[PDB]
Structure formats: structure tokens, C-alpha cells
């Protein structure tokens, strides 16, 4: 059972594809964010979060993503493995991206602060 | 590079050299670097409609028509890749001529030194 901090660090390293030494500023930022008091999430109810994700996907004419979300929510509810379903549902809703909207290629201007 | 362009833009707007706009450049970089919640509208037509409504609300119907014409021209020119973002920015930067500008108190100059 890797400690959540070590797991988050490994996740950051895996997602960014960089060594710990190249993500030191990002690791510090992540540690600060996780340790910082955050306002409550928009939805803390598993069923409400699932319904909000479904409604948002349907409103965006993303019926395939709405069906996938409904199926994943049904599977999660039936499996009963997760104790805090609301947290996972809220995370998934917060991380959802519209596949039709072309990824906003990060302007080269961000590189100015990278140095 | 986009960073050099932003610095040049700051220098042009402020009327100072890039070296003299370093604090303003830093402020801009900080603002851009902050995590922002997703924009309310990422649809060009919704942003255009919001801008039109805001221009009409200021009783600037001629300016609203001019804005609509400029948006049509920009869309036909096809130079901008993210029309919704530019339209949202233009709407956000519009100022109502009827609402008396809250004159920045001379007191702000006191702290500049």
C-alpha cells in the first residue's frame, strides 16, 4: 500500500513522462495544492455527480460519452468495490473533456516561465 | 516566440521599453499561469451573441452593428483559429461609455514610488 504522497508523485512522473528531477517545481506545486485547503467540490453525492455528468454530456450533444458515463456509473455502483463513490464520480465529471472540441494547444508563451 | 510578442504588446500598450514593462510582463505571466475554471462559453456564436447583447445594453446600437460586421469579417477572413476565445475576450474588454469611469484615485500614484 504505497503512501498517497508517493502514489501521487509516481502518477505525476508517469503522466508527465519526466524524471523526478525534471518535475521538482511541479512536484512542489502538486504537494502545495494537495496540502492546501480547497473549497468543497461542486458535487459530493455519487448519484448527483453521476446525474450531473450525464446531463452535461447530453447537453453537449455527446451522446456516446453520456452512454459511456452511464455505463461506467452503473458498473461502479453494481461492483460495490469503492467506498467513496461520490469522490470518484466527482473526479470523473471534473476531468471530463469534450472529444469534439479540438485540444487548445498550449501557446508557446507558457515556455517563458519554464526557464 | 509568443512570450516575446506578449512583452512587445505590453511595451506598446504602456509606451515603455520591454525592460521598463518587466513588472507588467511578470504580472501578465502570473495571470496567464494561474489555473482558470473553464470558460462559460466556448462557442463563437454564443460569445458573439453575448457581446451583441452587452453592446445593445449600453445603447450603442451603431457600435453593436459595427461589432457584428467586424466579427463577420474576421470569420470570413479565417485568420483566427479560436474565434470563440477572441470574441469572448472582446466582449470581456468592452466598456460602457455611459457608466462614468471610476477614476483611479491619484492615490494609486502614491505607492508607485
Amino acid at each position: 500500500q504505497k503512501s498517497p504522497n508517493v502514489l501521487l508523485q509516481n502518477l505525476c512522473c508517469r503522466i508527465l513522462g519526466r524524471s523526478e528531477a525534471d518535475v521538482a517545481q511541479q512536484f512542489q506545486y502538486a504537494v502545495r495544492v494537495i496540502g492546501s485547503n480547497f473549497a468543497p467540490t461542486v458535487e459530493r453525492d455519487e448519484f448527483l455527480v453521476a446525474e450531473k455528468i450525464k446531463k452535461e454530456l447530453i447537453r453537449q450533444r455527446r451522446e456516446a460519452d453520456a452512454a459511456l458515463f452511464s455505463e461506467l456509473h452503473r458498473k461502479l455502483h453494481s461492483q460495490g468495490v469503492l467506498k467513496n463513490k461520490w469522490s470518484i464520480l466527482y473526479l470523473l465529471l471534473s476531468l471530463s473533456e469534450d472529444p469534439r472540441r479540438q485540444p487548445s494547444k498550449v501557446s508557446s508563451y507558457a515556455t517563458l516561465f519554464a526557464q | 516566440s509568443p512570450n516575446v510578442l506578449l512583452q512587445n504588446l505590453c511595451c506598446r500598450i504602456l509606451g515603455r521599453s520591454e525592460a521598463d514593462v518587466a513588472q507588467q510582463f511578470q504580472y501578465a505571466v502570473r495571470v496567464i499561469g494561474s489555473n482558470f475554471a473553464p470558460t462559460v462559453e466556448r462557442d463563437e456564436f454564443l460569445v458573439a451573441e453575448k457581446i451583441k447583447k452587452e453592446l445593445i445594453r449600453q445603447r450603442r446600437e451603431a457600435d453593436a452593428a459595427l461589432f457584428s460586421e467586424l466579427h463577420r469579417k474576421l470569420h470570413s477572413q479565417g485568420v483566427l483559429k479560436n474565434k470563440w476565445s477572441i470574441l469572448y475576450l472582446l466582449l470581456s474588454l468592452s466598456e460602457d461609455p455611459r457608466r462614468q469611469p471610476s477614476k483611479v484615485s491619484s492615490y494609486a500614484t502614491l505607492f508607485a514610488q
Partner: peptide
Amino acid sequence: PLTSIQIRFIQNMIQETLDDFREACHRD
């Protein structure tokens, strides 16, 4: 008077709009 179906629809719509506004403020 708003019919029970119309009243329920208006109430649900208002609740959705206020939840969306609260969610946007919270996310910001």
C-alpha cells in the same frame, strides 16, 4: 397558477440554474 407539472418543471429548471451557478463559482 402554474400547473403542478409546469410548477415542477420551472422549479427543476431554477434549481439546475442555481446549482450550475454555485458550481461555476465553486470551480473558480
